Structure 1
Amino acid sequence: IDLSALNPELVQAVQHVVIGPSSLIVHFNEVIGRGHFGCVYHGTLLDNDGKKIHCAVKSLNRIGEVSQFLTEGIIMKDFSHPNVLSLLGICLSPLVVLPYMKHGDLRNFIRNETHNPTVKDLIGFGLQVAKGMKYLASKKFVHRDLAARNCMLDEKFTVKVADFGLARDDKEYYSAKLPVKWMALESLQTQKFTTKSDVWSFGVLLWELMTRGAPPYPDVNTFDITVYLLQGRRLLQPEYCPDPLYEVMLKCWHPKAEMRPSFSELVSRISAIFSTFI
């Protein structure tokens, strides 16, 4: 890369979170995942006393695409919440270094046939997500792509709200590239986004949790979802979804953004629902 050909604002930021190349071992045959524009590798981060930290290392495959890449990392830099993915740092492709998430993404986790998360566990993951979003919303950050495929799960089954960004593999869900079936009605009609539109996404995420990762509206084509919603139609109540959790989802999908619950309300109500389970 030619550092000169990027905004000095992005440049000094990336220097506050820099990781010297000699502190980071990237294992290049050890590919976690590779999409069209980016890839992710296993990595080892050494600290100044020699202790090894297993990490994921995100990379570009390939000025514009480099400036976007670096910006995606920099956005994350000050998120510090246990339900939001954090940045370990950036190494000058430039390398964005993330903590390793043993269980990968939440959608793949809940679809895995060899494990049985209970209805309680699934509601539990939804609650963790609500807590990460309450934090993001407190910082006035709008996610715009909240979905189970963008939430990670660590060795302690802690959910980390994240966004694969350029490293998206799973791309059929986008059609601007737009995750239309997680989108609020007014984002679909205006291509504009808010915290209340993340709330709409959140309700769809909860439906993913309760169906163990079923695809939403599978008999609806990308572009047709707008008129479907305007006809007064919504996602059906999953078989094991408690009535009050389905009522939560419906409130998330209210046509008036301002009538959707806040993430603070979601946290309190879903905590109550979750506590009712043996």
Structure 2
Amino acid sequence: LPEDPRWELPRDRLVLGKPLGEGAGQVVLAEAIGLDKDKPNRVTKVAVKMLKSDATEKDLSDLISEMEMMKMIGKHKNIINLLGACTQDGPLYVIVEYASKGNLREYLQARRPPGEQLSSKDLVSCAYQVARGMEYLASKKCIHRDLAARNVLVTEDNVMKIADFGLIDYYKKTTNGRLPVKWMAPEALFDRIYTHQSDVWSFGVLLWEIFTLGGSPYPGVPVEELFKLLKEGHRMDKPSNCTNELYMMMRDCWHAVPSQRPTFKQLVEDLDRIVALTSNQ
């Protein structure tokens, strides 16, 4: 691989830790010593993406393309930023920001009341940050294609960061058994058309995910039945503990006509206003 001095990190400055997630492409917790040359004695907790034992040549290509995509897209608070890479004299390591509190689905579920505590403002605030993150990506012509709570990460300071933005079997399930088709917009699901507007649909589900504290969409619904519901124009019920205004927002996001869905630009402005008017108690 060519070196790119801007981003390169010597391997002796990277102490690998425990695995965060696998694939069979995998991710590992690590510590970078002097991630920026200006601050060389600092240790930073990072996540390192790398190949697994039986990766293809095209798997490598994909990881490289992901790295280059991130360089193109640039920095933003509400995305997982590239920090560095090891491309020389050893396997490819792609160093990204570490998110201590896991993905948003896990974060929400872990903070459900008994049967630490997220206020109404916290929930709305969560949606704002995710919208702000998607607006940036969208402004950089980046289409996520699987925007969901599982692909939003949460830092030590409760900052929402969008993941796997720089990357089909419909019946394949996620790590804990959810079907990604349930986040897909109709035009994407049927006509295989992906736009920013299709991400807005998916953001609609993400909203629903938030105000159900990591609820599972369409529980017990297989793929064939999902097609049925969408063709019938069915829409998920308003969650309990969720205003009409926010439900309207989801419904707007789930507008059958893509052009009639709001832009993330609009969703950022609306959520800005709502956060400030939502109480923290």
- TM-score, normalising length from structure 1? 0.87
Partner of residue 72, structure 1: 66
Give the deviation of 1:273 after TM superposition: 2.0
- Structure 2 Cα separation of the partners of residues 257 and 228 of structure 1: 18
- Structure 2 Cα separation of the partners of residues 186 and 79 of structure 1: 29
Aligned with residue 81 of structure 1, among 76, 79, 97: 76
- Which residue identity is paired with 2:67? G
- Structure 1 Cα separation of the partners of residues 233 and 19 of structure 2: 44
Equivalences for 1:86-105 in 2 at 5 Å? 86-92=81-87, 93-105=91-103
Partner of residue 173, structure 1: 178
Gaps of 5+ in 2: 168-172
Deviations 1:171-229 (A, max 9, x none): 6435xxxx210000100111120000000000000000000111101131134322211
The worse-fitting range, judged by mean Cα deviation, of 217-226 and 82-91 is 217-226
Contact kept in structure 2, 1:79 and 1:85, CA below 8 Å: no
Give the deviation of 1:20 after TM superposition: 1.9
2:104 is equivalent to residue 109 of structure 1 = no
- Structure 2 Cα separation of the partners of residues 207 and 111 of structure 1: 13
Aligned with residue 26 of structure 1, among 12, 16, 35: 16
- Structure 2 Cα separation of the partners of residues 25 and 221 of structure 1: 43
Give the deviation of 1:44 after TM superposition: 1.2
Q: Which runs of 4+ in 1 moved over 6 A?
A: none
Give the deviation of 1:268 after TM superposition: 1.1
What is the root-mean-square deviation in Å for CA atoms of aligned residues?
A: 2.1
* Count, aligned residues: 260
Give the % identical residues. 37
Give the deviation of 1:154 after TM superposition: 0.8
- Structure 2 Cα separation of the partners of residues 211 and 222 of structure 1: 22
Equivalences for 1:1-278 in 2 at 5 Å? 3=1, 11=2, 16-27=6-17, 30-33=18-21, 35-47=22-34, 48=37, 49-62=40-53, 63-77=57-71, 78-92=73-87, 93-113=91-111, 115-163=116-164, 170=175, 172-174=177-179, 179-278=180-279
Contact kept in structure 1, 2:69 and 2:166, CA below 8 Å: no
The worse-fitting range, judged by mean Cα deviation, of 240-249 and 45-54 is 45-54
Partner of residue 6, structure 1: none
- Which residue identity is paired with 1:246? Y
The worse-fitting range, judged by mean Cα deviation, of 16-25 and 66-75 is 16-25
- TM-score, normalising length from structure 2? 0.86
In 2 relative to 1, CA 227–15 (structure 1 residues): closer, same or farther, beyond 3 Å? farther
